[PDB]
């Protein structure tokens, strides 16, 4: 009865499989990013425990100190899924202040299928309670990890960032960025 | 433990919930569509048994008689999911020849999460065999109906079209189109 299992597979085959092994090559297409130092070429997938987000990350409730700042989008990646439709995959680059030091540059994204988990818990409580939802998050997380790590082309090109709605996303990002 | 179960929920909350109760109102935004007769304002969701499609529907392997023809896109519906990003939901209108009679007009779409089922069966056979895939289709289908039918705003605004890769999608569409109220 685990909805998260099918949510992870879709995320991979319907998105990450295309965009993760070409991300680094796509970022370097722009001189500004090619020159930039302190730039991690890995996609940071934000996974809030409450599966919720309602606004842009700069000056967000997750960024009280106003450290995160939108810098711009990457080069669009042309791809067709099923041959039925042609899309342009692009990502957002954010600038994270590191105090007096040169600010960091990274690619952050939310796990869009997590909204489906939240939406369920609010629209159909008889199918998913706040407790089950919290469990499905863990399920989604671990299952996603397995899928990704089972792909050589995607290994080392991503990072799963799990945090609580109280934690400072800026303080969490840096702790990861340096360890990268 | 059904991958199809989670595939249906995402389809609804991440798409159909937004686009289905506003589809008819969106179609009438174009004069050409307001005038057009023999036009069903319901979204026809194509569900091939093999979870596969590789090209445009006009002149496709599902349309040997070459009756289906792209007519144009509907008016885009601006909507935000999570408020983080703004998208434009639009759909494709197709013209289905009905012999000597006036051709039909409808909105057909594929169930994009079905590709994930196919992709699995080819990339990870040890997780989904060709047989399980066929079973997950039924699961996805039956579950999807329930979710939709459980929403009053979406009722009567959709239709599930199930067919085999051998059947003529044009011959299948009409059989549904005519039977539609
Ligand atoms: N489920 C989702 N989660 C997170 N972000 C999403 C999203 N769906 C769309 N977006 C973002 O919104 C952009 C424009 O969406 P739009 O729906 O108006 O126009 C879309 C849409 O009509 C179609 N498209 C995108 N994803 C699709 C999908 N999974 N299935 C079917 N059509 C899709 O391709 C067009 C352009 O795609 P493009 O990626 O270059 O650009 C997309 C993408 O960046
Ligand atoms: N262009 C893009 N940019 C960013 N992320 C992308 C993306 N295309 C796909 N994804 C990711 O993969 C999932 C879509 O899986 P799938 O496309 O097979 O199945 C999708 C698709 O069938 C439908 N859907 C979502 N957005 C759509 C759109 N703009 N147009 C048409 N269908 C859409 O809803 C299903 C679940 O989508 P969900 O949003 O919950 O979650 C998305 C999203 O997490």
Swiss-Prot record, chain B:
Location(s) in or outside the cell: Endoplasmic reticulum membrane
Residue span relative to the full protein: 193 to 372 of 377
Record text on subunit structure and interactions: Homodimer.
Function: Sensor of cytosolic DNA from bacteria and viruses that promotes autophagy. Acts by recognizing and binding cyclic GMP-AMP (cGAMP), a messenger produced by CGAS in response to DNA in the cytosol. Following cGAMP-binding, promotes the formation of autophagosomes, leading to target cytosolic DNA for degradation by the lysosome. Exhibits guanine base-specific ligand recognition. Binds 3'-3'linked cGAMP, 2'-3' linked cGAMP and 3'-3' linked c-di-GMP with much greater affinity as compared to 3'-3' linked c-di-AMP.
Superkingdom, taxonomy of origin: Eukaryota
Residue spans, topological domain Cytoplasmic: 2-181
Binding site for 3',3'-c-di-GMP: 15, 81, 87, 109-112
Binding residues annotated for 2',3'-cGAMP, in chain numbering: 15, 81, 87-88, 112
The family this protein is said to belong to: Belongs to the TMEM173 family.
Protein name as annotated: Stimulator of interferon genes protein
């Amino acid at each position: 009865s685990n909805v998260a299992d099918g949510l992870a597979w879709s995320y991979y085959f319907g998105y990450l499989k295309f965009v993760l092994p070409e991300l680094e090559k796509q970022i370097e297409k722009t001189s500004k990013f090619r020159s930039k130092e302190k730039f991690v070429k890995k996609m940071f997938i934000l996974i809030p425990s409450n599966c919720f987000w309602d606004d842009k990350i700069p000056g967000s409730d997750y960024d009280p100190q106003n450290r995160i700042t939108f810098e711009g989008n990457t080069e669009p990646l042309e791809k067709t899924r099923g041959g039925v439709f042609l899309r342009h995959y692009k990502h957002s680059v954010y600038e994270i202040k590191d105090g007096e030091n040169e600010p960091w540059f990274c690619i952050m994204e939310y796990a869009t299928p997590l909204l489906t988990l939240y939406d369920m818990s609010v629209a159909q409580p008889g199918e998913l309670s706040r407790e089950e939802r919290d469990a499905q998050v863990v399920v989604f997380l671990r299952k996603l990890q397995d899928i990704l790590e089972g792909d050589r082309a995607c290994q080392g090109k991503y990072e799963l960032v799990t945090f609580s709605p109280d934690r400072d996303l800026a303080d969490v990002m840096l702790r990861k960025l340096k360890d990268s």
